[PDB]
Amino acid sequence: DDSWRGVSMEAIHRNRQPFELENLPPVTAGNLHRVMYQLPIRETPPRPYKSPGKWDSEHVRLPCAPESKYPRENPDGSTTIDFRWEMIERALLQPIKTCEELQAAIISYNTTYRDQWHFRALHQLLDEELDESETRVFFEDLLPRIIRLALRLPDLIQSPVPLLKHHKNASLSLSQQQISCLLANAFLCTFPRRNTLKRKSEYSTFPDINFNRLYQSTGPAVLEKLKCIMHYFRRVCPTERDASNVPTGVVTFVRRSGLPEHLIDWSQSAAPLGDVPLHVDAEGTIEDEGIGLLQVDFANKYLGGGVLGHGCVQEEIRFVICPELLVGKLFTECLRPFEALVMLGAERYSNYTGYAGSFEWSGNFEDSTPRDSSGRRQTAIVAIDALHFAQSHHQYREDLMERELNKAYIGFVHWMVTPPPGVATGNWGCGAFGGDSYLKALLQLMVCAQLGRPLAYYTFGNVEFRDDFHEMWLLFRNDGTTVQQLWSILRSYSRLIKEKNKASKKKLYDFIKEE
Ligand SMILES: Cc1cc(Cn2c(=O)n(Cc3cnc(C)s3)c(=O)c3cc(S(=O)(=O)NC4(C)CC4)ccc32)n(C)n1
Numbered sequence: 455d456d457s458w459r460g461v462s463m464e465a466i467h468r469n470r471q472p473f474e475l476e477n478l479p480p481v482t483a484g485n486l487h488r489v490m491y492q493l494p495i496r497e498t499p500p501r502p503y504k505s506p507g508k509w510d511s512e513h514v515r516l517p518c519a520p521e522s523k524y525p526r527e528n529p530d531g532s533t534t535i536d537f538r539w540e541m542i543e544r545a546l547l548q549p550i551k552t553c554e555e556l557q558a559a560i561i562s563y564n565t566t567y568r569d570q571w572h573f574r575a576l577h578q579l580l581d582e583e584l585d586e587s588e589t590r591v592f593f594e595d596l597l598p599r600i601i602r603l604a605l606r607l608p609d610l611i612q613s614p615v616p617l618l619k620h621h622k623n624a625s626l627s628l629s630q631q632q633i634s635c636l637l638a639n640a641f642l643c644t645f646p647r648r649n650t651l652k653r654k655s656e657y658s659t660f661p662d663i664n665f666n667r668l669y670q671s672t673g674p675a676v677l678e679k680l681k682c683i684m685h686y687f688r689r690v691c692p693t694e695r696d697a698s699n700v701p702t703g704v705v706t707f708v709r710r711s712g713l714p715e716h717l718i719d720w721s722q723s724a725a726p727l728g729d730v731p732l733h734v735d736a737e738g739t740i741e742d743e744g745i746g747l748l749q750v751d752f753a754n755k756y757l758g759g760g761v762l763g764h765g766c767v768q769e770e771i772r773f774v775i776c777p778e779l780l781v782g783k784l785f786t787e788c789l790r791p792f793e794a795l796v797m798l799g800a801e802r803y804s805n806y807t808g809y810a811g812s813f814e815w816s817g818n819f820e821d822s823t824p825r826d827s828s829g830r831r832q833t834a835i836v837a838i839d840a841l842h843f844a845q846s847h848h849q850y851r852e853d854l855m856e857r858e859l860n861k862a863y864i865g866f867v868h869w870m871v872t873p874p875p876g877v878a879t880g881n882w883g884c885g886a887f888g889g890d891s892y893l894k895a896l897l898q899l900m901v902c903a904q905l906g907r908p909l910a911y912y913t914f915g916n917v918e919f920r921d922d923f924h925e926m927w928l929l930f931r932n933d934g935t936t937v938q939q940l941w942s943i944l945r946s947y948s949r950l951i952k953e954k955n956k957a958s959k960k961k962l963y964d965f966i967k968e969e
């Protein structure tokens with residue numbers, strides 16, 4: 455009758471309006487929080503913060519650094535060592551009228567990759583997908599705006615951009631405007647030292663950021679991601695007339711890194727599972743129906759996954775409809791097992807249809823989501839990376855159930871004085887990545903019970919699973935089942951599977967029935 459089972463959405467918000475409960479404290483500058491704009495925000499967009507630039511192992515190597523030098527071959531075949539930022543400016547201010555000339559300009563400061571990079575998805579989009587006039591508008595309007603924005607980087611970033619490395623709790627806050635500039639540079643593949651595919655290299659524990667690998671990819675989902683990105687730049691680049699369309703606010707990136715001190719012993723959790731306000735919806739999406747909640751990103755340990763590539767499932771889609779997330783790739787070291795990344799403030803610019811191979815851009819989206827005191831849209835996303843399984847049976851090992859419990863734990867912790875809003879999630883690391891929906895739902899319930907967060911769970915058209923999970927929360931509620939007690943049952947199922955989906959839930963019935 456209704457799409458959903460369990461408690462209502464009013465309930466998930468603790469009967470207060472969405473957005474009254476916040477997911478992150480306000481931005482303030484500190485030892486553990488670098489802020490790229492001036493506090494407090496008076497004018498908009500925020501005014502950039504000024505401090506000496508850094509070209510070192512602790513900060514982003516910015517394309518405009520005076521330390522960035524580059525060899526050029528010449529007309530006549532000799533070598534000049536020049537400043538790469540000067541070469542980038544010269545290349546991008548030559549006229550560029552075709553897809554081939556764009557590729558040659560980008561390659562002119564990436565000459566190592568001359569015979570490896572071919573921007574086939576860009577050729578497909580401009581030569582075959584758009585008609586002659588939409589393509590003329592690309593070269594006469596859009597691309598000049600992207601270049602002009604990229605070339606303002608020394609004006610918009612006047613402060614070193616720190617890397618968020620392994621095992622450090624740190625935050626970084628930037629303006630949406632600053633992010634549009636960094637992303638324009640990525641679009642034009644300007645970031646130094648971030649292209650090599652060599653196995654052990656300076657940045658190999660970091661994601662890719664230059665957009666070349668997207669351009670090298672194929673198929674319809676890749677073009678639709680390109681359309682999302684184009685659209686973002688139409689939305690946020692100043693037009694020839696004015697700059698009133700430029701976004702006004704802020705985005706914050708928080709590396710959460712758990713200490714041994716924070717590790718839950720799951721057999722000592724007396725938390726009642728049925729006391730979790732659980733809302734299980736078979737329609738709806740996290741980005742729409744989960745407004746006000748901590749929304750989950752079914753992440754790869756490299757933030758963004760294959761968004762610059764062939765990837766086009768849950769993570770990748772979020773990163774092209776809310777492209778400000780992409781800048782996380784620039785400074786976020788890959789996640790270790792007891793770490794997570796919270797991203798607050800990312801505006802949505804695109805609508806979409808489908809999923810995976812059927813993903814399509816389906817139009818403009820005007821985000822009216824309210825901004826917090828710090829100038830951030832109150833869209834809070836946590837990146838947590840599930841394990842992938844070649845073998846489904848492997849996931850029922852005790853150590854790898856604990857791993858996932860602890861991964862979701864560090865993603866979902868609150869660590870603020872005000873009460874935590876609900877989490878909005880779903881079949882995390884399931885489908886083709888090997889995970890069991892039935893188990894991953896319980897692990898997430900355990901974590902929410904333990905932390906005291908409501909849980910809004912989306913099954914995406916699967917009514918059967920909605921019911922099996924609702925019914926199993928009812929058995930917990932009136933048996934007063936407990937985290938440690940469900941852990942005990944789950945460890946039993948571990949040793950059972952060893953000696954050799956729908957059957958996990960059958961055997962809790964059994965171990966529960968005896969109580
Ligand atoms: C209501 C709805 C949405 C969708 C499409 N979709 C999807 O198919 N999957 C995979 C699965 C399909 N059927 C299953 C039983 S799983 C999704 O995982 C999915 C996820 C989202 S989301 O996470 O809310 N948002 C994004 C993409 C921004 C992060 C949305 C649609 C999904 N379906 C079938 N039914």
Ligand SMILES: [Cl-]
Nearest residue numbers: 526536541544
């Ligand atoms: Cl030159």
